[PDB]
Enzyme design. Structure first.
Site, PDB file in Angstrom:
ATOM      1  N   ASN A  90      46.602  42.899 100.188  1.00 54.14           N
ATOM      2  CA  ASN A  90      46.847  42.652  98.957  1.00 54.14           C
ATOM      3  C   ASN A  90      47.873  42.894  98.286  1.00 54.14           C
ATOM      4  O   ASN A  90      48.979  41.555  99.059  1.00 54.14           O
ATOM      5  CB  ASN A  90      45.908  42.537  97.949  1.00 54.14           C
ATOM      6  CG  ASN A  90      46.043  41.169  96.805  1.00 54.14           C
ATOM      7  OD1 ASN A  90      47.093  41.132  96.521  1.00 54.14           O
ATOM      8  ND2 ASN A  90      45.113  41.251  95.149  1.00 54.14           N
ATOM      9  N   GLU A 404      58.681  38.535  98.846  1.00 53.66           N
ATOM     10  CA  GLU A 404      57.860  39.281  97.406  1.00 53.66           C
ATOM     11  C   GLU A 404      58.013  40.474  97.855  1.00 53.66           C
ATOM     12  O   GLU A 404      57.560  41.326  99.378  1.00 53.66           O
ATOM     13  CB  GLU A 404      56.426  37.983  98.188  1.00 53.66           C
ATOM     14  CG  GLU A 404      55.664  39.091  97.019  1.00 53.66           C
ATOM     15  CD  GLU A 404      54.284  38.289  97.041  1.00 53.66           C
ATOM     16  OE1 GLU A 404      53.685  37.185  97.052  1.00 53.66           O
ATOM     17  OE2 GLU A 404      53.002  39.419  97.085  1.00 53.66           O
ATOM     18  N   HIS A 406      55.952  42.523  95.730  1.00 53.93           N
ATOM     19  CA  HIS A 406      54.836  43.134  94.684  1.00 53.93           C
ATOM     20  C   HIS A 406      54.320  44.385  95.140  1.00 53.93           C
ATOM     21  O   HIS A 406      54.052  44.852  93.473  1.00 53.93           O
ATOM     22  CB  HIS A 406      53.925  42.089  95.164  1.00 53.93           C
ATOM     23  CG  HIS A 406      52.352  42.159  93.755  1.00 53.93           C
ATOM     24  ND1 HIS A 406      51.927  40.954  94.238  1.00 53.93           N
ATOM     25  CD2 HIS A 406      52.591  42.675  92.907  1.00 53.93           C
ATOM     26  CE1 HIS A 406      51.079  41.200  93.093  1.00 53.93           C
ATOM     27  NE2 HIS A 406      51.568  42.146  92.428  1.00 53.93           N
ATOM     28  N   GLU A 449      56.089  37.215  93.152  1.00 49.10           N
ATOM     29  CA  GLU A 449      55.697  38.433  92.677  1.00 49.10           C
ATOM     30  C   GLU A 449      56.780  39.187  93.147  1.00 49.10           C
ATOM     31  O   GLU A 449      56.181  40.239  94.170  1.00 49.10           O
ATOM     32  CB  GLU A 449      54.585  39.092  92.737  1.00 49.10           C
ATOM     33  CG  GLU A 449      53.156  37.865  92.626  1.00 49.10           C
ATOM     34  CD  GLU A 449      51.966  37.960  92.532  1.00 49.10           C
ATOM     35  OE1 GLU A 449      52.328  38.008  94.144  1.00 49.10           O
ATOM     36  OE2 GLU A 449      50.644  38.074  92.085  1.00 49.10           O
ATOM     37  N   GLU A 525      50.104  28.345  89.736  1.00 48.95           N
ATOM     38  CA  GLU A 525      49.000  29.024  90.569  1.00 48.95           C
ATOM     39  C   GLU A 525      47.879  29.366  89.362  1.00 48.95           C
ATOM     40  O   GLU A 525      48.088  29.776  87.939  1.00 48.95           O
ATOM     41  CB  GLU A 525      49.960  30.355  91.168  1.00 48.95           C
ATOM     42  CG  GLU A 525      50.132  30.602  91.749  1.00 48.95           C
ATOM     43  CD  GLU A 525      50.424  32.117  92.320  1.00 48.95           C
ATOM     44  OE1 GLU A 525      51.078  32.462  92.867  1.00 48.95           O
ATOM     45  OE2 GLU A 525      49.356  32.968  92.318  1.00 48.95           O
ATOM     46  N   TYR A 526      47.202  28.083  89.632  1.00 46.75           N
ATOM     47  CA  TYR A 526      45.721  28.541  88.642  1.00 46.75           C
ATOM     48  C   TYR A 526      44.241  28.422  89.012  1.00 46.75           C
ATOM     49  O   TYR A 526      44.522  27.394  89.580  1.00 46.75           O
ATOM     50  CB  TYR A 526      45.538  27.727  87.563  1.00 46.75           C
ATOM     51  CG  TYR A 526      45.451  26.043  87.638  1.00 46.75           C
ATOM     52  CD1 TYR A 526      44.717  25.541  86.890  1.00 46.75           C
ATOM     53  CD2 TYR A 526      47.001  25.359  88.245  1.00 46.75           C
ATOM     54  CE1 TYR A 526      44.614  24.381  87.154  1.00 46.75           C
ATOM     55  CE2 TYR A 526      46.438  24.152  88.665  1.00 46.75           C
ATOM     56  CZ  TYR A 526      45.507  23.431  87.571  1.00 46.75           C
ATOM     57  OH  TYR A 526      44.984  22.410  87.731  1.00 46.75           O
ATOM     58  N   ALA A 527      43.019  28.589  87.988  1.00 47.30           N
ATOM     59  CA  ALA A 527      42.238  27.964  88.496  1.00 47.30           C
ATOM     60  C   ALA A 527      41.740  29.555  90.208  1.00 47.30           C
ATOM     61  O   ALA A 527      41.567  28.265  90.886  1.00 47.30           O
ATOM     62  CB  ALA A 527      42.022  26.471  89.416  1.00 47.30           C
ATOM     63  N   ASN A 585      42.754  48.063 102.940  1.00 46.80           N
ATOM     64  CA  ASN A 585      42.109  46.936 102.895  1.00 46.80           C
ATOM     65  C   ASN A 585      41.826  46.394 102.073  1.00 46.80           C
ATOM     66  O   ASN A 585      41.396  46.960 100.936  1.00 46.80           O
ATOM     67  CB  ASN A 585      41.395  46.101 104.264  1.00 46.80           C
ATOM     68  CG  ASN A 585      40.087  46.094 103.838  1.00 46.80           C
ATOM     69  OD1 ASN A 585      39.549  45.418 103.050  1.00 46.80           O
ATOM     70  ND2 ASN A 585      39.388  47.477 105.128  1.00 46.80           N
ATOM     71  N   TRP A 987      40.297  38.910  88.350  1.00 49.26           N
ATOM     72  CA  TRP A 987      40.111  40.213  88.885  1.00 49.26           C
ATOM     73  C   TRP A 987      39.948  40.301  86.966  1.00 49.26           C
ATOM     74  O   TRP A 987      40.176  41.851  86.817  1.00 49.26           O
ATOM     75  CB  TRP A 987      41.020  40.956  89.029  1.00 49.26           C
ATOM     76  CG  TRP A 987      42.382  39.848  88.359  1.00 49.26           C
ATOM     77  CD1 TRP A 987      43.257  39.671  87.531  1.00 49.26           C
ATOM     78  CD2 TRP A 987      43.294  38.441  89.223  1.00 49.26           C
ATOM     79  NE1 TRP A 987      44.351  38.996  87.792  1.00 49.26           N
ATOM     80  CE2 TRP A 987      44.324  38.016  88.955  1.00 49.26           C
ATOM     81  CE3 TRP A 987      42.289  37.673  90.403  1.00 49.26           C
ATOM     82  CZ2 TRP A 987      44.614  37.152  89.295  1.00 49.26           C
ATOM     83  CZ3 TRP A 987      43.388  37.093  90.763  1.00 49.26           C
ATOM     84  CH2 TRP A 987      44.493  36.881  90.623  1.00 49.26           C
TER      85      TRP A 987
HETATM   86 MG   LIG Z   1      51.604  39.522  95.329  1.00 45.57          MG
HETATM   87 NA    NA Z   2      43.973  36.182  97.386  1.00 45.46          NA
END
Ligand SMILES: [Mg+2]
Ligand code: NA
Ligand SMILES: [Mg+2]
Ligand code: NA
Ligand code: NA
Ligand code: NA
Ligand code: NA
Ligand code: NA
Lengths: 1011, 204
Positions: A90, A404, A406, A449, A525-527, A585, A987
């Site tokens: 991620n 990205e 992140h 991100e 981004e949501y839900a 991972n 999360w």
């Molecule tokens: Mg990310």
């Molecule tokens: Na994900």
């Protein structure tokens, strides 16, 4: 030179970016977007060899094919062929964070292809090769000679092969590097793959050619008049006889045409562009483009001589639409949008990240059939065909740069570094130069991100400068920085603030009115739809509709990123993070979709469709108020079908044509409804059906629906007097109740109904006991692991409190005989290390009618984490084929996710009562049920339930659905109350306060009997 | 109140009385009340109440019981929210504790008489020789709901014989956003359809 370890070198000898070209040599063909002889495909079988590092590649490979190589299909990801393993991580980079360096053990894929080239292509003009997608960097050789180098896995890399090819057979050698400095800008939450995963083609262009062209469309106050402005650029030798003609077609009908020689207006003190020309065409009453009605026109750009000889032609679909932000609102053709969008990764369960038309069309149809009107390209420019489909099918697209970072610390370490501006700029500029002509694209995004760095502000300004037609958005740095025209937070909640330092996530309602703020807010981004999720979805939509500036958002996300693996006997199963030996991972966090990898819907999809409906309804007396949320179309393919039923029994129905204008209203009065034969609750259900087929739906498609409780007539008639009387038999160990063919057995030591008999058959495998826990949902777990425990996560709080290890202590168990029944009374206390978590008090009343009324009253210690549920369960001995019930259905529904379900009589095979989430958990629940029928059993009351062949224990102990095994009998779970599933994010605790079991004392009653 | 059932059962150590009523109007059953009264050898009367409210009838002002006690004591002692009058949507200021006030203070002298003096979240109520236990809302005074309803000015109210008691399992919000249109928020309207509550009545 190690060009793959220097963000200063992102390419070598690469041709400029531009809109899709085909170089038609026949205009009529360009008009119809038919195939071009000048645009060949090199897709197919190629030669491929895997190497552990570029230093291991033999010099012989450039000149001659490697006999050890295999023949594989291109495009593709070599991980999908098994050459090396795909990695799912991620945030943490898959490689050591040491910019700009990458590992020395850098997986290298050597692709080669022997292909023919006709002399006609080499005798005149330019022959270039085009690689739509190469992950992540590559060098290119043609006939043993080095051509160029390229980076950025999501945009086409083109090179001129004119000086390298020869008539006849030729051989390409492409060395693809898995890792490169460019990987530092591709840290998206998804599988980490590599290879030539997008189309490879060969394009021939005349020496004197159309090198670029921009199409624009501006309108007047009411959009009744428009001007199509087309700037055309050429390369080659300028000649006075050269000309550019731009014609616009609406189907077969030519709407306008203009011609002119090269030579643009004066730009500055040095003159103007002699190699450019801008054509302007007037169009009266244009058919505007929108997701509602995707009217498209065809723009044909011809490069020819004044005598009429065509040199070449390019073209594109044109959608007359205006996108602008005014007074705080995002407007499309002057109307405020309501984004019903979703984030969509390019993912295929077998092919990995290779897209194909079939799959793209399938996603688009499912999306529009479920009331989605927009998609976000999370988080990179998509396969070129995707924009063509969205233009034609009608979807609003957010085109996002492939950037990205992140994993960096802080997140903007690179984006605020000027030495990375070049690499970043190419990912933004080459995206705009490629897609700026697609009407579907209404918003440009600077990436995802990567924090907020100065490079973002710089590129943000660049876009606003080159393309004023579209707003620019970016979420990094707080969702409301100076690099975004839209407040686009991710996972910001509706009412609850999340005051994180530096980058807080304010409730969206509060966000809009912070001092000085005035921009529109659309969540990027949501839900988070991970597993059993989307709980609270209806809360966002209620807000989007009430707040003008809350203009919707993009659900995260469309499809699970699960991959297919095969077991010992060739049986395929859905795998996730770590299932390929990939480590470190992030396991199942790669599966957050509304549909499974194979596009089979998840239960949440139906909730999204419902909440995203385009028709709103209101009931008053016998009058239904239908309100349209459409902005441009009338309800020209919709009729309203109503149906009134009593406890599932259809009493009356009808049909009324829908003739509502966009944003308008229609009043429909129901006929005099006849009073129901018996007692019960009358329910009204309306549905909007499209009689005729469309490009995205079949005839009879249901687009919206709603329900209302009408008159209710409470049963006030006492049932017939029983004939027989239950007999009680007290023994040291049991309390047995006998009534004809039925036998009830209550164990006095445990205090539970340990068994029931109907004639000679036993009805239970495991006693009927209370249950206050459930197999943890992805949202219950969060980021908690055996290695890294999250004491805040719901699952951890339950474990820590002893909820799963609670042992029932019998406090009381007595039997009493009544005039017409036997009454059993029990009381249990669940405790953990001296702490009494719950106390259960029950009474079982078996009467002559053969019915067993179970009355339950629970006490939940105020200081223990609120329980996941409050009900009973048991493993029934029988295994029936059908499941019939009166309640919310037919699909799985939970407290905070049941608006889409309707109350009625449902009947489904036992298997449909189980939701095959790849990561097993509590599932299949159905709330608001008044009657449940299974085999010879019938339960009545007001409860939620789930029934399947998998116990809660097995579900919480199994990691993959394919490892589950049907248990003996059928596991029944009847809950008087059940906690919400949440989902605002996965999360952190996301179950809203109103859906938490915190009342302290709960009551519910059930009646068990024969069907 | 139309009686549907009224039975009696003698148990091992108690008498169980079961009843069922249906309140109607013009042939319409507004609510249905089901109860059981359990009296054991300790002299304690356990009342179990389960009510049904027609989904299509306006949500009721309250769901509970009431009666006029012969008794007339000076104090009212209770374990709940107080010491002042509090209602479901106006009890944040009230505190949970053991409160003890003169009977008159359990009455709020609004110039225009109406339901008043209620106290929520009460687990124990003590009046004279009586004690009620559970988790209920209640008001207690010398004026009946009927008198309050028919009297225009507080000075015209007369103390009735004995004491009027209203024990509620549930009570509707009082609202207030304005006083000329429905203002009780949805979460404070009794619309669950089915309600349950239990009480224990005893002496000392
Ligand atoms: Mg990310
Ligand atoms: Na994900
Ligand atoms: Mg480089
Ligand atoms: Na393809
Ligand atoms: Na809105
Ligand atoms: Na119609
Ligand atoms: Na599990
Ligand atoms: Na009055």
């Amino acid at each position: 030179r190690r060009d793959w370890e220097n963000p200063g070198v992102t390419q070598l000898n690469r041709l400029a970016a531009h809109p899709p070209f085909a170089s038609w040599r026949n205009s009529e063909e360009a008009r119809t977007d038919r195939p071009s002889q000048q645009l060949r495909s090199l897709n197919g079988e190629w030669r491929f060899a895997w190497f552990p590092a570029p230093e291991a590649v033999p010099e012989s490979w450039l000149e001659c094919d490697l006999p050890e190589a295999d023949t594989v299909v291109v495009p593709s990801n070599w991980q999908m062929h098994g050459y090396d393993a795909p990695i799912y991580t991620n945030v943490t980079y898959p490689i050591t964070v040491n910019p700009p360096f990458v590992p020395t053990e850098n997986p290298t894929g050597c692709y080669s292809l022997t292909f023919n080239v006709d002399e006609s292509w080499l005798q005149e003009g330019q022959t270039r090769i085009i690689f739509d997608g190469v992950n992540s960097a590559f060098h290119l050789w043609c006939n043993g000679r080095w051509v160029g180098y390229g980076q950025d896995s999501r945009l086409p890399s083109e090179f001129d092969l004119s000086a390298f090819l020869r008539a006849g057979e030729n051989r390409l050698a492409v060395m693809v590097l898995r890792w490169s400095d460019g990987s530092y800008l591709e840290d998206q939450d998804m599988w980490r793959m590599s290879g030539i995963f997008r189309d490879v083609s060969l394009l021939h262009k005349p020496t004197t050619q159309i090198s670029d062209f921009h199409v624009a469309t501006r309108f007047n106050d009411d959009f009744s008049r428009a001007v199509l402005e087309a700037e055309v650029q050429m390369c080659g030798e300028l000649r006075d006889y050269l000309r550019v003609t731009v014609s616009l077609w609406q189907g077969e009908t030519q709407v306008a045409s203009g011609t002119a020689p090269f030579g643009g207006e004066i730009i500055d003190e040095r003159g103007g562009y002699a190699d450019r020309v801008t054509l302007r065409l007037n169009v009266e009453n244009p058919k505007l483009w929108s997701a509602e009605i995707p009217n498209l026109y065809r723009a044909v750009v011809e490069l020819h001589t004044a005598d009429g000889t065509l040199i070449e032609a390019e073209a594109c679909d044109v959608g007359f639409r205006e996108v602008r932000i005014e007074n705080g609102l995002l407007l499309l053709n002057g109307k405020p949008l309501l984004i019903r969008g979703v984030n969509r990764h390019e993912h295929h369960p077998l092919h990995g990240q290779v897209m194909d038309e079939q799959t793209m069309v399938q996603d688009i149809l499912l999306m529009k059939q479920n009331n989605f009107n927009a998609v976000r390209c999370s988080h990179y420019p998509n396969h070129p065909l995707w924009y063509t489909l969205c233009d034609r099918y009608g979807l609003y697209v957010v085109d996002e740069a492939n950037i990205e970072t992140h994993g960096m610390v802080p997140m903007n370490r690179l984006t605020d570094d000027p030495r990375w501006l070049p690499a970043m700029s190419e990912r933004v500029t080459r995206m705009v130069q490629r897609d700026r002509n697609h009407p579907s694209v209404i918003i440009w995004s600077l990436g995802n991100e990567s924090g907020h760095g100065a490079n973002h502000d710089a590129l943000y300004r660049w876009i606003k400068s080159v393309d004023p037609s579209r707003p620019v958005q970016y979420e990094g740095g707080g969702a409301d920085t100076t690099a975004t025209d839209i407040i686009c937070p991710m996972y910001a909640r509706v009412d609850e603030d999340q005051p994180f330092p530096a980058v807080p996530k304010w409730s969206i309602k509060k966000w809009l009115s912070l001092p000085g703020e005035t921009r529109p807010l659309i969540l990027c981004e949501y839900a988070h739809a991970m597993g059993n999720s989307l709980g609270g979805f209806a809360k966002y939509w209620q807000a989007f509709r009430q707040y003008p500036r809350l203009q919707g958002g993009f659900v995260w996300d469309w499809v699970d990123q699960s991959l297919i693996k095969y077991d010992e006997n060739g049986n395929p199963w859905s795998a996730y993070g770590g299932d390929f030996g990939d480590t470190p991972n992030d396991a199942q966090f790669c599966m957050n979709g509304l549909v499974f990898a194979d596009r089979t819907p998840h239960p949440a999809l139906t909730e999204a469709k419902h909440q995203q409906q385009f028709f709103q309804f209101r009931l008053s007396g016998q009058t239904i108020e239908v309100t349209s949320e459409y902005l441009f179309r009338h309800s020209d393919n919709e009729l309203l079908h109503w149906m009134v039923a009593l406890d599932g029994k259809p009493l009356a129905s009808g049909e009324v044509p829908l003739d509502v204008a966009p944003q308008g209203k229609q009043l429909i009065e129901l006929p005099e409804l006849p009073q129901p034969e018996s007692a019960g609750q009358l329910w009204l259900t309306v549905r909007v059906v499209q009689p005729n087929a469309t490009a995205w739906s079949e005839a009879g498609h249901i687009s919206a629906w709603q329900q209302w409780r009408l008159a209710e007539n409470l049963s006030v008639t006492l049932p017939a007097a029983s004939h027989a009387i239950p007999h009680l038999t007290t023994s040291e160990m049991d309390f047995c109740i006998e009534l004809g063919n039925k036998r009830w057995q209550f164990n006095r030591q445990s205090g539970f109904l340990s068994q029931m008999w109907i004639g000679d058959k036993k009805q239970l495998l495991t006693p009927l006991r209370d249950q206050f826990t459930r197999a943890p949902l992805d949202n219950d777990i969060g980021v908690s692991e055996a290695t890294r425990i999250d004491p805040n996560a719901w699952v951890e709080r339950w474990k820590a409190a002893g909820h799963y290890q609670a042992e029932a202590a019998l406090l009381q168990c007595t039997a009493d005989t009544l005039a017409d029944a036997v009454l059993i009374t029990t009381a249990h206390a669940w405790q953990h290390q001296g702490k009494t978590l719950f106390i259960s008090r029950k009474t079982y009343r078996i009467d002559g009618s053969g019915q067993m009324a179970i009355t339950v009253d629970v006490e939940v210690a105020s200081d223990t984490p609120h329980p996941a549920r409050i009900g009973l369960n048991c493993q029934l001995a029988q295994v029936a084929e059908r499941v019939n019930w009166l309640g919310l259905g037919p699909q799985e529904n939970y407290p905070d996710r049941l608006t889409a379900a309707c109350f009625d009589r449902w009947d489904l095979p036992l298997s449909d009562m189980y939701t095959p989430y790849v990561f097993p958990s509590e599932n299949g629940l159905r709330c608001g049920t008044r009657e449940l029928n299974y085999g010879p059993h019938q339960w009545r009351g007001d409860f939620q339930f789930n029934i399947s062949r998998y116990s809660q224990q097995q579900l919480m102990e199994t990691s993959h659905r394919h490892l589950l095994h049907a248990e003996e009998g059928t596991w029944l779970n009847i809950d008087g109350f059940h906690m919400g599933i949440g989902g605002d994010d996965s999360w952190s605790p996301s179950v809203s306060a109103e859906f938490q079991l915190s009342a302290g004392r709960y009551h519910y009653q059930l009646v068990w009997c024969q069907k």
